[PDB]
Amino acid sequence: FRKMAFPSGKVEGCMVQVTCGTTTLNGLWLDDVVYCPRHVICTSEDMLNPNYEDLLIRKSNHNFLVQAGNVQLRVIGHSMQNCVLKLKVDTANPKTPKYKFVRIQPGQTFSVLACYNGSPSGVYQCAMRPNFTIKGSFLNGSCGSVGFNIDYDCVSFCYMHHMELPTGVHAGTDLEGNFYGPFVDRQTAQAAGTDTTITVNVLAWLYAAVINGDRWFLNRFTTTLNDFNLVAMKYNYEPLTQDHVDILGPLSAQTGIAVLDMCASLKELLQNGMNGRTILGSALLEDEFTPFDVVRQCS
Ligand SMILES: *C(=N)Cn1c(N2CC3(C2)CC(F)(F)C3)c(-c2ccc(F)c(Cl)c2)c(=O)n(-c2cncc(Cl)c2)c1=O
């Protein structure tokens, strides 16, 4: 059992390099618009507290260089939308996939295509944490890398990378330029909230373990939503709702294991630990697989 990303080809053909003066980062080219982080218009002296509006007045169309590999795009308009710039270009991307922009909820997963200088370098699976950070793997130059899901033909873009916080976790926006959580595109102290564990995801992963033949943690007990939620609170797990129970319905049905029974098994794991045993080759409880992801990789 492994985190698996979506095939990246459809997004790879959308990545470009954006340069404003001496500042370069990655952009996303869809139809005749390139999307990128607005901090492309900054220099180092700006970063403690940029006035983006004032910085952008000194910028004309020709001050943005956009390159799609070799293909050299002509910028014919620009605007700022929240924390992204939209550069209108003369040429529609011929490789534009069917796509949508979506603002995800905490707990939801997506693939990241990490890019440097407009070139794709790696793909991996990630999650929006409850505190609205993502635990990405990004180096300097990665801004403008995107997070997405692929449903049949359609690319659903949900994340654009902006910044690494001092703690080494990552913050960024939806493709409308609104940050997830309370983060801002300046270099101030921005402490994260409690990184709580995504309970419904852990349950989904326990079901995937049963589907794949790891069953040692199935115990004799059941519990109630309220009693389980006391336990979740003590262990900094998200509260489980009836909605969560409902979305676990297919996995429950497939395995014959009532969601509240699986809850009682999780309770025991939280209270007693894993006593040196593994689940799906992991020595901790994994929370970055959704119910939806589990179905994908199991059947
Ligand atoms: C991303 N392509 C470059 N970079 C930044 N940058 C780029 C600048 C801000 C320096 C500049 F030229 F003036 C504009 C940041 C960053 C730092 C502070 C801040 F408020 C923002 Cl909005 C961004 C950054 O964090 N990273 C980054 C991203 N992911 C991982 C790492 Cl190790 C660094 C970055 O590459």
Numbering used by the authors: 3 to 301
How did the manuscript describe this experimental structure?
The SARS-CoV-2 3C-like protease (3CLpro), also known as main protease (Mpro) and nonstructural protein 5 (nsp5), is a promising drug target for COVID-19 therapy.
S-892216 is a reversible covalent 3CLpro inhibitor with highly potent antiviral activity and an EC50 value of 2.48 nM against SARS-CoV-2 infected cells. Covalent bond formation of the nitrile warhead produced an imine that formed a hydrogen bond with the main chain of C145, and the two carbonyl oxygen atoms of the pyrimidine-dione core formed hydrogen bonds with the main chains of E166 and G143. At the S1 site, the 3-chloro pyridine unit formed a hydrogen bond with the side chain of H163, similar to other 3CLpro inhibitors. The 3-chloro-4-fluorobenzene moiety filled the S2 pocket and formed a π stacking with the catalytic histidine of H41, with the 6,6-difluoro-2-azaspiro[3.3]­heptane lying on the lipophilic S1′ pocket. This is a unique nonaromatic interaction in the S1′ pocket that the other 3CLpro inhibitors do not have. The results indicate that S-892216 is a reversible covalent inhibitor with an estimated observed dissociation rates (k off(obs)) value of 4.06 × 10–5 s–1.
